[PDB]
Structure 1
Amino acid sequence: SNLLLQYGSFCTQLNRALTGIAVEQDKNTQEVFAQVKQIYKTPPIKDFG
Structure 2
Amino acid sequence: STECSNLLLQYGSFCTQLKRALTGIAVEQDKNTQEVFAQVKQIYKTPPIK
| Structure 2 alignment gaps of length 5 or more | none
The secondary structure found in structure 2 opposite 1:40 is strand
Bigger fraction of residues in helix? 2
Report the CA distance between 1:8 and its aligned residue.
4.3
C-alpha change, 1:43 and 1:7, in structure 2 (3 Å) is: farther
Structure 1: where are the runs of 5+ without partners? none
Give CA deviations for 1:6-26 in whole Å, capped at 9, x if unaligned. Answer: 234100000000000000000
Q: Which has the larger strand fraction?
A: 2
Q: Judging changes above 3 Å, is the alpha-carbon distance between structure 1 residues 4 and 36 closer, same or farther for their aligned structure 2 residues? A: same
Aligned CA RMSD, in angstroms, stands at 1.0
Aligned length, in residue pairs: 46
Deviation (angstroms), 1:33: 0.1
Q: Which aligned runs of 4 or more in structure 1 are off by greater than 2 angstroms?
A: none
